[PDB]
Structure formats: C-alpha cells, structure tokens
Amino acid sequence: MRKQLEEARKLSPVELEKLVREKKRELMELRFQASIGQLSQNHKIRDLKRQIARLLTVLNEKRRQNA
Template structure:
C-alpha cells in the first residue's frame, strides 16, 4: 500500500487497516517462530505498511484540517 493510497482513505479506514495489519504481523511472527514462514519479506513489508499508516494517522491527529476524503 502506497502513501498516496493511504492518504486517500478516511481516518476511520486507516485505523481499521492499521488494526488488521497489526494482526497480520502477529500471525507472521507466530509462523516465523514455528518455522512455517517461507517468505521473510512479508514481515518487512508488513512493518513498513504499519509505519506508513501510523505516520498518516499521526499527521491527521496533529492537523485535523488535512483529512482528505474522496467520495
């Protein structure tokens, strides 16, 4: 998920996506510890998506007028 795609989402959608992505990261960590994870790049990609989501969410919390909703 690219940063411009995240910025196009509403704040509620970003929060929901952040929760889903954190759950996905937790599943990947369990798979890694049990030896079932074969694609290690998914861990890195998921962490980066979480960072992007968190960054945009914090931008919006600091400046509520910057929220963009495409309808």
C-alpha cells in the same frame, strides 16, 4: 512502495485505525508460523513493520491538521 500513500492520504476520520488493526493481524500469523513454515518469508516480517509505520505517520499528520 508509493501506492499505499497514493490511497492513504484520502482516508481521513476513523477508518485508518481499523485498516491497520488487520495489518497487525497479518503479521501475527507470520510471527506464530516462523517456527513451522519458517522459510518462504524473510520478506514478510520486515516489510509489514515498514508498511505499518508509513500508515501511522499519516494518521498523526491528519490530526495535526487540527492540533
């Protein structure tokens, strides 16, 4: 959804790395707990893999502004 790109265009220098470290953390427990809880997701593994890629496109756009 566009509201993540609403705010992600602002954050230029270094904080966008540690803001996607924790969003990898947020799928680590989903990938662990897809063998016990295992049901109320199937949103959650495939939504996060898209909202990491749409935060790592802008991270290289805002470095090809330099190179």
